Amino acid sequence: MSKLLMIGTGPVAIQLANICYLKSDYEIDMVGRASTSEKSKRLYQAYKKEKQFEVKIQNEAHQHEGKFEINRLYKDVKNVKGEYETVVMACTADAYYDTLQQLSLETLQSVKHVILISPTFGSQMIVEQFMSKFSQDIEVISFSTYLGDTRIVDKEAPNHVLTTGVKKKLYMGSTHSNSTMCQRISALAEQLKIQLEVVESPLHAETRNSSLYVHPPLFMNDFSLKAIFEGTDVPVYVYKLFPEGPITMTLIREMRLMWKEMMAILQAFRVPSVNLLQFMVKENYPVRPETLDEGDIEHFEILPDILQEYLLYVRYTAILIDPFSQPDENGHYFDFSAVPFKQVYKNEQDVVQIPRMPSEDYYRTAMIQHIGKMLGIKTPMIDQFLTRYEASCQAYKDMHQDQQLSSQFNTNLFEGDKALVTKFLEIN
Amino acid sequence: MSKLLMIGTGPVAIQLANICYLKSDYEIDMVGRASTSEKSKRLYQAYKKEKQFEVKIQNEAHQHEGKFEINRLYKDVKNVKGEYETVVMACTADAYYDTLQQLSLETLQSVKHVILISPTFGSQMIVEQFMSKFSQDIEVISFSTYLGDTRIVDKEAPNHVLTTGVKKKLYMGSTHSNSTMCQRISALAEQLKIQLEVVESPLHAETRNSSLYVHPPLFMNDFSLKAIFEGTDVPVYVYKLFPEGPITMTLIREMRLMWKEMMAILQAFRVPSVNLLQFMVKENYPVRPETLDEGDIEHFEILPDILQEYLLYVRYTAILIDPFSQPDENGHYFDFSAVPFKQVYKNEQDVVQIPRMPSEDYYRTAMIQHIGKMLGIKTPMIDQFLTRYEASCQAYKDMHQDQQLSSQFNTNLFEGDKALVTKFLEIN
Ligand SMILES: Nc1ncnc2c1ncn2[C@@H]1O[C@H](COP(=O)(O)OP(=O)(O)OC[C@H]2OC[C@H](O)[C@@H]2O)[C@@H](O)[C@H]1OP(=O)(O)O
Ligand SMILES: Nc1ncnc2c1ncn2[C@@H]1O[C@H](COP(=O)(O)OP(=O)(O)OC[C@H]2OC[C@H](O)[C@@H]2O)[C@@H](O)[C@H]1OP(=O)(O)O
């Protein structure tokens, strides 16, 4: 019978494992890195003891809930034995290569489908090129993003996760147009009440994620980078205006410029372009009618380069509050924009980590840089983003020679991934 | 000896009376409207009883303080008897004509200088044309604004006023270039430590007031006008972003358009143009360097019509807080922008009044409209401003037929003033 390998043991992997448990005929195996990660250990110990996972639901609009037991929970990728026709990557995109490469030849040659839950731009190119050495005909499926928001509500019971929110719309593409797997997914989406736009390549679904265009400007600037690698004297906030946070005319210019460099790479691949404003306004969170002209967001992409900036700037000020929340007796709304920055932190073994943001945006940006390099496309804003982050890494190293740092502070990361997209694009 | 007539008995008039008391050789007479205004009565009764005015000071940087007694406090303009070489208009601009016209022929023919403390655009034209019938050679002096901020801290002692703030820079012009009066004023300004740019006509000083360009858009729109003539369900704020207040891309367009129509009338009069952004940023309140490009505010007037909008919009979001105030332990600054709207209100005799804003901006706008009409200059944004306010007046009349309303709800106001600027411009 059909085996499925789930790579990742966090809340995304658990939600996904439950969907397969309930709505597929796969026997499910799960693997983390409980040998080298206190987090994956806590998950291992907890599943071991209880012999169950549980998804709970917050809005009764969702029936992903359920308790469930999987077939085998592995402790490390290296223990994985045997054949699996389907492998779901529920880990972070910068680990897709590190983890597949640790699988056995028998495992890698048995695989028919690789499904990428939170891929970045070009993850499929990396994953297809890798698998191609062992699978003649590997199918690779990229999603735009994960289906919603799920979280551990108690760190001492990480096998119990909570899905708080579900996205409106997802996109999905495959190396195999309208494959049999594509069809089960959009049929599974239908059961889940999750609108799924099937898209024509995985790369195309990978560009329908808004954070790919707005996280690099928000986080890889001197303001944000100081807040993360060094303190601030006073709490400072991701989505507020300077001096309370990073947003300025300059940041918004940096965002439009990256958007346009990305649209260059996307036209190269004959991938359609993303109306960034309209994307944010219909598929992220609405603002009041009175705030944005409907023709301004429809025709966003025709508009002059400073009108585009002006409309992006305005969008971010509309969200400093939640304009659909219930006002105070004093006129005051929910402070939607007081999201703090996670700073650098020592893990359980006293090793400094960089938080997900910006260290996942260094990976995505470093890959987008590399693709654009080899299309002969110039990425000057991307370029600046990366030197900024690297100088902040080098400065942390110099300022903190008394400390164990993590592999994230290292030079020349992702040589593996960079070579796979090189082989891929030459051959393709 | 030299007599001075002070028209107005509020806190501006009292501060000014003290400056003349201390630094001039004028015997001072003061006149309000204690016959028809509970406010002017309270001032009359209070001065009567105490026989003193008092200016107190808040920042020790100021020596306008002082107790003082004037020579004669009149109860109504109509009591004014005798000859005065100088008359200071310390009242609101929309009353300059109503009040002078109540003076006696002997008084009007004796007058050599009319000094306009808070004139609007074209007040001098109105005042010179009126006085010209009685004074062959009247001198008229317009200030850009009043010298600072003074207030009554206790309504039962309105003869005791408090000057809280003093402007950086004032402008001043006269019908009589570098007159003897001009010279005493800039010498008096020097004593007061108040920088005074002497300007070449009064009209020119009357355009160096920022509220002339930004009050009509802020207050004469459907949002603001609802907040003033009808409640809001929840407190709403003058300087916040929609839905908390009126500021939108649309309001900012309405502000640039009025600015440019005004710059038309100003080029007609060969008056130089006002860099509105730079005016707000150096002469009103500073924002952080990181917020506005210095070349953007220097070259503001060359910039494209949507960049101008974008920079104005951005200026207003920089001020939602005071970015130079001391932050909270939580990152949070002083809520600089939560200035409520004064709404329509019944006075002591149960008569509905419209607050200063927008009823002083209806006068200024109605005059700017009239000037531009007779230069053949089109003022389409002004035009809209005025129909908006009038429809809100008409609606209050219909919705509130059970109520005594004030003369401010009337049609065809300012016929007097409108004819004086007509005679003036034809002849001039
Ligand atoms: N080299 C490597 N090898 C093996 N396992 C790895 C590796 N790197 C990360 N991970 C594991 O992926 C799992 C999911 O990541 P998690 O941080 O819990 O958050 P989510 O559950 O929300 O992740 C879902 C995606 O949303 C977007 C983002 O890209 C996420 O991947 C998690 O168990 C990770 O282990 P850990 O020990 O728990 O840290
Ligand atoms: N038709 C008419 N006739 C006689 N007197 C009149 C008339 N209209 C207004 N006023 C008086 O002008 C005085 C100053 O006005 P005020 O509201 O106290 O505020 P401020 O002292 O701060 O004024 C200074 C200027 O700053 C800007 C603005 O244009 C101000 O004029 C005040 O005593 C008014 O009488 P009241 O009885 O007290 O209401």
PDB file of C-alpha atoms in Angstrom, chain A residues 234-237 240-244 248-250 252-253 288-293 296 304 306-307 309-311 313-314 317-318 320-321 323 327-333 335 338, chain B residues 234-237 240-244 248-250 252-253 288-293 296 304 306-307 309-311 313-314 317-318 320-321 323 327-333 335 338:
ATOM      1  CA  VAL A 234      12.772  51.404  23.383  1.00  0.00           C
ATOM      2  CA  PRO A 235      10.475  48.772  21.890  1.00  0.00           C
ATOM      3  CA  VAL A 236      10.233  49.205  18.136  1.00  0.00           C
ATOM      4  CA  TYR A 237       7.707  47.723  15.751  1.00  0.00           C
ATOM      5  CA  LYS A 240       4.952  51.193  12.175  1.00  0.00           C
ATOM      6  CA  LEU A 241       6.254  54.429  10.674  1.00  0.00           C
ATOM      7  CA  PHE A 242       9.640  55.881  11.494  1.00  0.00           C
ATOM      8  CA  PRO A 243      10.728  56.386  14.270  1.00  0.00           C
ATOM      9  CA  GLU A 244       8.357  53.759  15.721  1.00  0.00           C
ATOM     10  CA  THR A 248       9.471  55.469   5.193  1.00  0.00           C
ATOM     11  CA  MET A 249       9.286  56.676   1.601  1.00  0.00           C
ATOM     12  CA  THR A 250      12.704  55.044   1.267  1.00  0.00           C
ATOM     13  CA  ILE A 252       8.602  51.816   0.042  1.00  0.00           C
ATOM     14  CA  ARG A 253      10.936  52.681  -2.811  1.00  0.00           C
ATOM     15  CA  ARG A 288     -11.896  50.846   3.739  1.00  0.00           C
ATOM     16  CA  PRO A 289     -13.216  51.860   0.289  1.00  0.00           C
ATOM     17  CA  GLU A 290     -12.433  55.515   1.055  1.00  0.00           C
ATOM     18  CA  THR A 291      -8.741  54.766   1.333  1.00  0.00           C
ATOM     19  CA  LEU A 292      -7.802  53.386  -2.112  1.00  0.00           C
ATOM     20  CA  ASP A 293      -9.305  54.145  -5.506  1.00  0.00           C
ATOM     21  CA  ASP A 296      -5.737  52.579  -8.660  1.00  0.00           C
ATOM     22  CA  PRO A 304       3.853  55.736 -12.595  1.00  0.00           C
ATOM     23  CA  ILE A 306       5.927  57.237  -7.607  1.00  0.00           C
ATOM     24  CA  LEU A 307       2.173  56.656  -7.660  1.00  0.00           C
ATOM     25  CA  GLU A 309       5.102  54.000  -4.122  1.00  0.00           C
ATOM     26  CA  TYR A 310       2.420  56.372  -2.866  1.00  0.00           C
ATOM     27  CA  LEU A 311      -0.264  53.659  -2.944  1.00  0.00           C
ATOM     28  CA  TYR A 313       2.865  53.697   1.471  1.00  0.00           C
ATOM     29  CA  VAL A 314      -0.837  54.522   1.890  1.00  0.00           C
ATOM     30  CA  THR A 317      -0.755  53.448   6.914  1.00  0.00           C
ATOM     31  CA  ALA A 318      -4.351  52.113   6.514  1.00  0.00           C
ATOM     32  CA  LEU A 320      -1.602  50.808  11.450  1.00  0.00           C
ATOM     33  CA  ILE A 321      -4.985  50.017  12.954  1.00  0.00           C
ATOM     34  CA  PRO A 323     -10.154  49.742  10.323  1.00  0.00           C
ATOM     35  CA  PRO A 327     -13.625  51.350  17.886  1.00  0.00           C
ATOM     36  CA  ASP A 328     -12.995  52.409  21.445  1.00  0.00           C
ATOM     37  CA  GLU A 329     -15.379  54.722  23.257  1.00  0.00           C
ATOM     38  CA  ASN A 330     -12.480  57.103  22.466  1.00  0.00           C
ATOM     39  CA  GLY A 331     -12.253  56.466  18.711  1.00  0.00           C
ATOM     40  CA  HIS A 332      -9.311  54.176  18.990  1.00  0.00           C
ATOM     41  CA  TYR A 333      -8.984  50.922  17.109  1.00  0.00           C
ATOM     42  CA  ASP A 335      -3.261  48.458  17.247  1.00  0.00           C
ATOM     43  CA  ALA A 338       2.479  46.755  16.962  1.00  0.00           C
TER      44      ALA A 338
ATOM     45  CA  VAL B 234     -17.452  57.438  18.160  1.00  0.00           C
ATOM     46  CA  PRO B 235     -14.971  60.244  18.794  1.00  0.00           C
ATOM     47  CA  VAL B 236     -13.240  61.230  15.573  1.00  0.00           C
ATOM     48  CA  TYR B 237     -10.107  63.290  15.115  1.00  0.00           C
ATOM     49  CA  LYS B 240      -5.902  61.203  11.894  1.00  0.00           C
ATOM     50  CA  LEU B 241      -6.247  58.879   8.912  1.00  0.00           C
ATOM     51  CA  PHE B 242      -9.556  57.501   7.727  1.00  0.00           C
ATOM     52  CA  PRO B 243     -11.601  56.082   9.442  1.00  0.00           C
ATOM     53  CA  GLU B 244     -10.210  57.777  12.576  1.00  0.00           C
ATOM     54  CA  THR B 248      -6.959  60.227   2.654  1.00  0.00           C
ATOM     55  CA  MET B 249      -5.282  60.442  -0.742  1.00  0.00           C
ATOM     56  CA  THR B 250      -8.413  62.348  -1.754  1.00  0.00           C
ATOM     57  CA  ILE B 252      -4.432  65.460   0.036  1.00  0.00           C
ATOM     58  CA  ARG B 253      -5.380  65.916  -3.601  1.00  0.00           C
ATOM     59  CA  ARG B 288      12.819  63.335  11.554  1.00  0.00           C
ATOM     60  CA  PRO B 289      15.464  63.584   8.795  1.00  0.00           C
ATOM     61  CA  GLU B 290      14.739  59.984   7.763  1.00  0.00           C
ATOM     62  CA  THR B 291      11.186  60.866   6.827  1.00  0.00           C
ATOM     63  CA  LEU B 292      11.569  63.506   4.081  1.00  0.00           C
ATOM     64  CA  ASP B 293      14.339  63.954   1.536  1.00  0.00           C
ATOM     65  CA  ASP B 296      12.184  66.867  -1.929  1.00  0.00           C
ATOM     66  CA  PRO B 304       5.195  66.189 -10.182  1.00  0.00           C
ATOM     67  CA  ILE B 306       1.456  63.102  -7.368  1.00  0.00           C
ATOM     68  CA  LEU B 307       4.870  63.358  -5.721  1.00  0.00           C
ATOM     69  CA  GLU B 309       0.585  64.722  -2.905  1.00  0.00           C
ATOM     70  CA  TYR B 310       2.738  61.846  -1.685  1.00  0.00           C
ATOM     71  CA  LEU B 311       5.012  64.167   0.320  1.00  0.00           C
ATOM     72  CA  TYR B 313       0.414  62.729   2.785  1.00  0.00           C
ATOM     73  CA  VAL B 314       3.706  61.514   4.282  1.00  0.00           C
ATOM     74  CA  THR B 317       1.573  60.632   8.872  1.00  0.00           C
ATOM     75  CA  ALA B 318       4.918  61.728  10.448  1.00  0.00           C
ATOM     76  CA  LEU B 320       0.357  61.306  14.004  1.00  0.00           C
ATOM     77  CA  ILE B 321       2.802  61.204  16.892  1.00  0.00           C
ATOM     78  CA  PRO B 323       8.550  62.030  16.815  1.00  0.00           C
ATOM     79  CA  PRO B 327       8.888  57.436  23.930  1.00  0.00           C
ATOM     80  CA  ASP B 328       6.997  55.176  26.275  1.00  0.00           C
ATOM     81  CA  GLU B 329       8.655  52.170  27.867  1.00  0.00           C
ATOM     82  CA  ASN B 330       6.499  50.498  25.174  1.00  0.00           C
ATOM     83  CA  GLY B 331       7.715  52.510  22.168  1.00  0.00           C
ATOM     84  CA  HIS B 332       4.728  54.756  22.105  1.00  0.00           C
ATOM     85  CA  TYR B 333       4.907  58.493  21.614  1.00  0.00           C
ATOM     86  CA  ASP B 335      -0.588  61.174  20.404  1.00  0.00           C
ATOM     87  CA  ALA B 338      -5.871  63.313  18.548  1.00  0.00           C
TER      88      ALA B 338
END
